[PDB]
Design an enzyme around this catalytic site. Sequence first.
Site, PDB file in Angstrom:
ATOM      1  N   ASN A  29     -18.054 -36.619  49.798  1.00  0.00           N
ATOM      2  CA  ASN A  29     -18.381 -37.828  50.884  1.00  0.00           C
ATOM      3  C   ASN A  29     -18.612 -39.100  50.193  1.00  0.00           C
ATOM      4  OD1 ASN A  29     -19.879 -35.069  51.455  1.00  0.00           O
ATOM      5  ND2 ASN A  29     -19.146 -36.295  53.358  1.00  0.00           N
ATOM      6  N   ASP A  83     -26.709 -36.790  60.999  1.00  0.00           N
ATOM      7  CA  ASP A  83     -27.372 -37.164  62.389  1.00  0.00           C
ATOM      8  C   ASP A  83     -28.996 -36.695  62.588  1.00  0.00           C
ATOM      9  OD1 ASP A  83     -28.100 -38.668  64.432  1.00  0.00           O
ATOM     10  OD2 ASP A  83     -27.086 -37.163  65.826  1.00  0.00           O
ATOM     11  N   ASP A 155     -15.715 -19.868  66.277  1.00  0.00           N
ATOM     12  CA  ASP A 155     -16.341 -18.307  66.399  1.00  0.00           C
ATOM     13  C   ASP A 155     -17.303 -17.954  65.637  1.00  0.00           C
ATOM     14  OD1 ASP A 155     -15.041 -15.870  67.648  1.00  0.00           O
ATOM     15  OD2 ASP A 155     -15.275 -15.235  65.443  1.00  0.00           O
TER      16      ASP A 155
END
EC number: 2.5.1.16
Lengths: 262, 262
Positions: A29, A83, A155
Amino acid sequence: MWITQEITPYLRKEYTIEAKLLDVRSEHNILEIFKSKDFGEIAMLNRQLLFKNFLHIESELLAHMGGCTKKELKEVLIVDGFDLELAHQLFKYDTHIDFVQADEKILDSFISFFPHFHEVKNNKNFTHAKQLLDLDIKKYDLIFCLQEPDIHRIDGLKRMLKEDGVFISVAKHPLLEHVSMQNALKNMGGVFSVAMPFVAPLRILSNKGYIYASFKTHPLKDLMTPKIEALTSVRYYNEDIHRAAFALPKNLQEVFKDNIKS
Amino acid sequence: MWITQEITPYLRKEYTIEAKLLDVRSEHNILEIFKSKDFGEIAMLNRQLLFKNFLHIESELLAHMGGCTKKELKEVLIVDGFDLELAHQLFKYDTHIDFVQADEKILDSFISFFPHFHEVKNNKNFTHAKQLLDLDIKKYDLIFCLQEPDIHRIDGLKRMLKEDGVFISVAKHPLLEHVSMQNALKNMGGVFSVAMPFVAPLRILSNKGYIYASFKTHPLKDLMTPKIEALTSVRYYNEDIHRAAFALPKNLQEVFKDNIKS
């Protein structure tokens, strides 16, 4: 100088900035925060923008989209994002929040960017883990996928949900990119009996959409106004917004008609 | 090659374009059209952008906003703009349209751009005029001001609207410019007992807002779905879209508290 947001390869937004205040990079990142006269601060997380003065919109909409469509929220799960503002809004409900982010260095880098950063981290019912396989086995009343999930991830989270649970994930704007939103809905349909797209009303600076997926709980039928009117200190969310979020134009309803489970 | 569009002085949008297709200029207006890999063609009229492949969006919303909130409309007035598509959508009602626009040279420059250009100009019930005074004195059921009208413009048009008539006009997006919209609503309130703001749902590519005004006729209460479900040639407009357009975040409801008339 300035930075640029990508809405389409043939349409870009350019934000003028005062100065760069921070630059953290990890293994997978890259985070950059900039001073902004328009939004106070702008965080560029991997070719993605966050606007400080407006963090309340999405955080409120998603948090309460689920919290006001369910009776009790005891265990909520959030994954693939940083977040923490979403968590704060979720803490306006008696609930525990297992937050999953493998990149601590980045998440903590948001220390003065998320206004409710210390409040959320200080919470006794906020649990941070680097991976899903760090948590204790349980089912969730609500799960938030802060990043468009692939059929695999879908899933894997569908299995950690409760029968009466709700799974909210991110997608593209349905009008700008109906094709992509169509594929988003198709995946979601394969495991849920409810899959409806929505957007953040009035948010005009972002190609983003979302999906409200479940096994039965409906985002409008089960909408509960008493839990709405009880929220304190919200500045965006309300019932008008809730309902408006699912409004779809004639054309898109048609194109999505075999992908929408209501 | 690109063309820019300003949202704020520190926020712009950049639309890559294939090439310039037209460049018409009068003493007071400037029109250029470009080929667009995204929207077929984009028309930049005095820095306002139009998208050939999505013209049905605004023309449907504005035209049927007043169209379906009123039992009968035989006299419609449109001023300060060149939107001939709004006129087209309006011809889906048994009605007459007075289109006022002093600049014919740039209006006729949209001969190929507006899909329904020819069908609207040659309509037996369409009357083009350079200025209001050149018209047969009468009251209208509908008045469209395609530009944000000052107080003087407001008073004038106001004195031409019928008892149960309706006035729809343009303003700024209240998301990034609530002050502007608050004034626009202020100017419209001192004169109408109904002044409500609305936007175009899902139109993330527009810093444009609107105002629905009247002496009583209401956009939500007086909405007739029979008229809505009577339009079988529309691609965007419907009841969900109609109602959602008026939804507002909680903070803007508070700020606009002293200017909105419901």
